[PDB]
Scaffold this active site. Sequence first.
Site, PDB file in Angstrom:
ATOM      1  N   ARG A 153       0.842  -1.213  -0.078  1.00 45.14           N
ATOM      2  CA  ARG A 153       0.017   0.017   0.120  1.00 45.14           C
ATOM      3  C   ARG A 153       0.937   1.202   0.059  1.00 45.14           C
ATOM      4  NH1 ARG A 153      -4.087   0.112   4.339  1.00 45.14           N
ATOM      5  NH2 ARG A 153      -3.791   2.279   4.337  1.00 45.14           N
ATOM      6  N   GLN A 180      -7.978   4.484  -4.522  1.00 45.98           N
ATOM      7  CA  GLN A 180      -9.060   5.414  -4.427  1.00 45.98           C
ATOM      8  C   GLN A 180      -8.432   6.719  -4.601  1.00 45.98           C
ATOM      9  OE1 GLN A 180     -11.359   4.341  -0.513  1.00 45.98           O
ATOM     10  NE2 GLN A 180      -9.577   2.986  -0.144  1.00 45.98           N
TER      11      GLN A 180
HETATM   12  C1  LIG Z   1       4.180   6.028  11.045  1.00 47.62           C
HETATM   13  C2  LIG Z   1       2.842   5.483  11.165  1.00 47.62           C
HETATM   14  C3  LIG Z   1       2.135   5.462   9.786  1.00 47.62           C
HETATM   15  C4  LIG Z   1       0.670   5.063   9.580  1.00 47.62           C
HETATM   16  N1  LIG Z   1       0.128   5.087   8.360  1.00 47.62           N
HETATM   17  C5  LIG Z   1      -0.946   4.580   8.330  1.00 47.62           C
HETATM   18  C6  LIG Z   1      -1.564   4.716   7.281  1.00 47.62           C
HETATM   19  O1  LIG Z   1      -1.271   5.080   6.037  1.00 47.62           O
HETATM   20  N2  LIG Z   1      -2.827   3.993   7.166  1.00 47.62           N
HETATM   21  C7  LIG Z   1      -3.634   3.573   8.271  1.00 47.62           C
HETATM   22  O2  LIG Z   1      -4.838   2.934   8.114  1.00 47.62           O
HETATM   23  N3  LIG Z   1      -2.828   3.551   9.247  1.00 47.62           N
HETATM   24  C8  LIG Z   1      -1.712   3.822   9.513  1.00 47.62           C
HETATM   25  N4  LIG Z   1      -1.133   3.901  10.726  1.00 47.62           N
HETATM   26  C9  LIG Z   1      -1.888   3.225  11.746  1.00 47.62           C
HETATM   27  C10 LIG Z   1      -3.003   4.076  12.550  1.00 47.62           C
HETATM   28  O3  LIG Z   1      -2.441   5.348  13.063  1.00 47.62           O
HETATM   29  C11 LIG Z   1      -3.601   3.230  13.745  1.00 47.62           C
HETATM   30  O4  LIG Z   1      -3.644   1.962  13.093  1.00 47.62           O
HETATM   31  C12 LIG Z   1      -4.853   3.766  14.007  1.00 47.62           C
HETATM   32  O5  LIG Z   1      -5.728   4.416  13.095  1.00 47.62           O
HETATM   33  C13 LIG Z   1      -4.484   4.941  15.292  1.00 47.62           C
HETATM   34  O6  LIG Z   1      -3.850   4.186  16.206  1.00 47.62           O
HETATM   35  P1  LIG Z   1      -2.969   4.942  17.496  1.00 47.62           P
HETATM   36  O7  LIG Z   1      -3.306   6.442  17.459  1.00 47.62           O
HETATM   37  O8  LIG Z   1      -3.721   4.185  18.733  1.00 47.62           O
HETATM   38  O9  LIG Z   1      -1.608   4.485  17.427  1.00 47.62           O
HETATM   39  P2  LIG Z   1      -0.603   4.979  16.436  1.00 47.62           P
HETATM   40  O10 LIG Z   1      -1.037   5.613  15.165  1.00 47.62           O
HETATM   41  O11 LIG Z   1       0.399   3.842  16.269  1.00 47.62           O
HETATM   42  O12 LIG Z   1       0.305   5.884  17.121  1.00 47.62           O
HETATM   43  C14 LIG Z   1       1.202   5.603  18.433  1.00 47.62           C
HETATM   44  C15 LIG Z   1       2.109   6.651  18.530  1.00 47.62           C
HETATM   45  O13 LIG Z   1       2.747   6.622  19.798  1.00 47.62           O
HETATM   46  C16 LIG Z   1       4.162   6.782  19.606  1.00 47.62           C
HETATM   47  N5  LIG Z   1       4.731   6.281  20.796  1.00 47.62           N
HETATM   48  C17 LIG Z   1       4.899   4.989  20.836  1.00 47.62           C
HETATM   49  N6  LIG Z   1       5.535   4.392  21.920  1.00 47.62           N
HETATM   50  C18 LIG Z   1       6.008   5.517  22.708  1.00 47.62           C
HETATM   51  C19 LIG Z   1       6.469   6.000  23.832  1.00 47.62           C
HETATM   52  N7  LIG Z   1       7.110   4.916  24.812  1.00 47.62           N
HETATM   53  N8  LIG Z   1       6.627   7.329  24.199  1.00 47.62           N
HETATM   54  C20 LIG Z   1       5.958   8.359  23.445  1.00 47.62           C
HETATM   55  N9  LIG Z   1       5.464   7.882  22.298  1.00 47.62           N
HETATM   56  C21 LIG Z   1       5.489   6.854  21.706  1.00 47.62           C
HETATM   57  C22 LIG Z   1       4.378   6.267  18.506  1.00 47.62           C
HETATM   58  O14 LIG Z   1       5.845   7.088  17.646  1.00 47.62           O
HETATM   59  C23 LIG Z   1       3.263   6.865  17.508  1.00 47.62           C
HETATM   60  O15 LIG Z   1       3.220   8.221  16.884  1.00 47.62           O
HETATM   61  C24 LIG Z   1       0.313   4.296  10.870  1.00 47.62           C
HETATM   62  C25 LIG Z   1       1.086   4.504  12.100  1.00 47.62           C
HETATM   63  C26 LIG Z   1       2.132   4.987  12.242  1.00 47.62           C
HETATM   64  C27 LIG Z   1       2.897   4.836  13.632  1.00 47.62           C
END
Ligand SMILES: Cc1cc2nc3c(=O)[nH]c(=O)nc-3n(C[C@H](O)[C@H](O)[C@H](O)COP(=O)(O)OP(=O)(O)OC[C@H]3O[C@@H](n4cnc5c(N)ncnc54)[C@H](O)[C@@H]3O)c2cc1C
Length: 445
Positions: free
Chosen positions: A189, A229
């Site tokens: 992707r 898309q």
């Molecule tokens: C770089 C990246 C790119 C992504 N791209 C896509 C995409 O194109 N399409 C899609 O559908 N989903 C994508 N995702 C996943 C998507 O964000 C998740 O599946 C969901 O939508 C939201 O999850 P979240 O906010 O709980 O966690 P995440 O989106 O994974 O965010 C977790 C964050 O916590 C931070 N972190 C982790 N451990 C620590 C710590 N100990 N101290 C401080 N910070 C910390 C990480 O750096 C990250 O920024 C991506 C995730 C990442 C990390």
Amino acid sequence: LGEEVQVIIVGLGIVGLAAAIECREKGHSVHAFEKSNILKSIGDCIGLQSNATRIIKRWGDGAVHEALRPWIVSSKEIRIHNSSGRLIIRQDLSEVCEQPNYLLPRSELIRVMYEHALKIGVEISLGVEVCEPSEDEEGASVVALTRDGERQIVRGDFIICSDGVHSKMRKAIMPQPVEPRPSGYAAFRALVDTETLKGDPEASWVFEGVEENDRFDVFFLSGAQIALQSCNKGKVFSWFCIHQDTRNLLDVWTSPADPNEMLDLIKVWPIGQRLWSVIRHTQPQKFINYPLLNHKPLDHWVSSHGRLILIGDAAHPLSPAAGQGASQGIEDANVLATSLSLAGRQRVSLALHVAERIRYARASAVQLISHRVNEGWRNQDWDAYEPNEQNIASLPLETWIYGHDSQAYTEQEFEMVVRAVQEGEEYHATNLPDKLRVQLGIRNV
Ligand SMILES: Cc1cc2nc3c(=O)[nH]c(=O)nc-3n(C[C@H](O)[C@H](O)[C@H](O)COP(=O)(O)OP(=O)(O)OC[C@H]3O[C@@H](n4cnc5c(N)ncnc54)[C@H](O)[C@@H]3O)c2cc1C
């Protein structure tokens, strides 16, 4: 006494930013920590369904929704094709898109939410890795580590652990990890480079009608399910390709995959060349091959003293599909902030446990439905059988999910959940279909 509530947020992906905004607009002091430079573009597109957009619409008196207006989905159907590119099924989206849905680069969603969080006074510290959480009956603390090795103790009333699928906070709640099961599938992707896409005449077809209706094409080939898309009037094109892959791939968004593996998969079927005419404009470093792993629900999300809670992908990671993965995380943030405001500052542990009871079965049901989709693929033959909308990775598209108002539900049910938490009884949530809870093996927290 009257001192402000001190919220600590670990991780500023989509869910941590949503939690920061929700908590700050309840008047709390919010200090969010993030280890990476999140303003750098990475990944491709994220979708948000109506259950998430109805939450986002409340933020900043509608200002965030106004910023996201260019990204409202204008597709009215999914056009599903066979391996010659013949149109087989048009799946109507008019109900799914009755209320706004978004599709946009994740980095642009991050930027918009980040700018709003700063504007309303969220304290944000980038380049900080949070570790070593602890808690007692009166508060919680974490260690904030910069990259140069300076340590600082940070204290707060509770910790929101929104640190994603690889959450290190998760070991504070669950002592033992449960390893996810590989589905046997992965997704190529990426976003396409729009500038080089323009001016390739062999790819000009992909722009047809995108200023009026976002493109949403699916193609079924032997061993390959491809989605194509567009969004924001053709300013952005994205694609994915589900395929079998038994390699030991890491579920991260950072490593470049081999584009020729994708080309070889599709070029031997009649429509492959036409699909490649667009997908070849993906920047060569932007090809991601993301394994689709199935995570079981956690036993619970809230810590022993009730001052740490896992939300988002730290709690209920799903495959990148529907929009529901991200959308469920945004419901976490909304329910948690609403619960905190109904419970009051003197009842933090109650607020976190109420939020967990409201969210747990609904989030687990979306997760297990996600598993069923990719478990079905092993029994399917996308070459012999006519394309079937039931097999698409974008499922589920269910009204009980995207039509739900998590805030209103929480307001109505709060006192009932409080009684369940305090009496130690089961809470039977009605924010998912009645039979669905028992049907999926879901065990209440
Ligand atoms: C770089 C990246 C790119 C992504 N791209 C896509 C995409 O194109 N399409 C899609 O559908 N989903 C994508 N995702 C996943 C998507 O964000 C998740 O599946 C969901 O939508 C939201 O999850 P979240 O906010 O709980 O966690 P995440 O989106 O994974 O965010 C977790 C964050 O916590 C931070 N972190 C982790 N451990 C620590 C710590 N100990 N101290 C401080 N910070 C910390 C990480 O750096 C990250 O920024 C991506 C995730 C990442 C990390």
